[PDB]
Amino acid sequence: SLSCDRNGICKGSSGSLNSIPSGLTEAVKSLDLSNNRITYISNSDLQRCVNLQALVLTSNGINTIEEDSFSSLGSLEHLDLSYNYLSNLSSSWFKPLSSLTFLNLLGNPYKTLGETSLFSHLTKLQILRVGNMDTFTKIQRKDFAGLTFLEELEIDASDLQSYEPKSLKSIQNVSHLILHMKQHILLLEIFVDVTSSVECLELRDTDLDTFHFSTNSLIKKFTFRNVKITDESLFQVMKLLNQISGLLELEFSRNQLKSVPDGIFDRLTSLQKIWLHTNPWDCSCPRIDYLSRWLNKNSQKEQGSAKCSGSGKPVRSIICP
Numbered sequence: 001s002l003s004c005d006r007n008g009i010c011k012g013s014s015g016s017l018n019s020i021p022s023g024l025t026e027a028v029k030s031l032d033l034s035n036n037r038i039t040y041i042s043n044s045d046l047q048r049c050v051n052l053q054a055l056v057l058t059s060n061g062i063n064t065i066e067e068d069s070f071s072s073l074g075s076l077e078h079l080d081l082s083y084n085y086l087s088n089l090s091s092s093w094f095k096p097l098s099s100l101t102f103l104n105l106l107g108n109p110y111k112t113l114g115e116t117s118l119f120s121h122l123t124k125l126q127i128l129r130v131g132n133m134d135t136f137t138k139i140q141r142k143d144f145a146g147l148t149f150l151e152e153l154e155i156d157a158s159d160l161q162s163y164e165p166k167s168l169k170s171i172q173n174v175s176h177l178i179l180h181m182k183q184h185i186l187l188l189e190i191f192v193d194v195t196s197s198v199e200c201l202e203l204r205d206t207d208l209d210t211f212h213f214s215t216n217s218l219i220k221k222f223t224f225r226n227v228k229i230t231d232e233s234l235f236q237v238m239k240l241l242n243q244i245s246g247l248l249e250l251e252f253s254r255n256q257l258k259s260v261p262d263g264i265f266d267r268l269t270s271l272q273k274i275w276l277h278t279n280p281w282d283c284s285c286p287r288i289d290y291l292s293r294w295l296n297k298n299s300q301k302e303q304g305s306a307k308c309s310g311s312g313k314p315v316r317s318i319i320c321p
């Protein structure tokens with residue numbers, strides 16, 4: 001069914017709706033129909049909701065949205081179409097939504113964002129999430145056109161195969177950029193386009209085997225999550241990090257790290273904080289000597305407490321002769 005409170009906040013509580021409820025009026029201020037069985041949105045469904053501020057359609061089976069389905073939604077600020085079955089995106093959907101501050105299109109099976117810029121006029125957008133884990137393979141220069149200031153941009157480009165240079169270059173500022181990408185071949189391509197516009201960069205799922213590194217970066221924090229790394233690739237990645245003059249925070253937690261090359265952190269003189277926890281550190285002595293000693297010398301940098309595999313003792317508590 002669909003229950004609305006006195007304030008116009010409506011929710012599709014039970015998962016049984018086969019389509020958007022009929023008869024919605026100008027009184028509806030929020031519509032959350034997540035986890036239902038909607039598969040199609042027609043032009044008339046939301047035609048009277050001129051005061052709708054949030055539309056959440058997460059996890060439905062939507063595969064078709066008629067061209068002008070959102071025409072009357074000029075008051076819309078939050079739109080979530082995440083995890084549906086949209087194989088292609090239409091710029092006409094976003095044309096009437098200039099007030100948007102949050103847009104989530106994550107989890108839909110589209111290969112690219114389309115042949116037409118989708119966000120050219122979303123001048124108030126703060127959070128944008130696009131991509132998917134298995135089908136998204138290309139990023140084009142026309143994507144993101146129009147976007148100048150963003151608080152958070154999340155791109156799941158797990159299967160990214162192509163990246164048109166300067167695609168991300170047009171955005172003047174992005175506070176937090178999260179990039180999911182399995183391969184590293186396009187990493188430096190993307191890096192040069194965002195080094196001067198991103199404050200916090202987060203790289204997820206990347207296989208860094210065989211990665212090699214050979215300006216005025218403004219990145220202040222770099223986070224790695226679920227990346228595949230080794231002493232050799234960590235050294236190459238550090239060559240890149242060593243070049244970021246103002247790098248203040250480095251998050252290396254959750255990357256299945258077992259060790260680090262001796263002296264790996266010696267050139268990060270401007271670093272203020274480092275995260276090394278949630279990693280199965282091999283605290284056998286010869287191997288862990290550098291890291292244990294480094295944590296004690298730079299006693300104020302570690303955030304959280306890195307622990308040893310097996311014993312679970314703090315890495316900094318290990319002393320090798």
Ligand SMILES: *[C@@H]1O[C@H](CO)[C@@H](O)[C@H](O)[C@H]1NC(C)=O
Pocket residue numbers: 087088
């Ligand atoms: C998406 O649009 C492209 C270009 O028209 C088309 O080739 C593709 O089949 C569409 N995806 C599907 C199957 O919905």
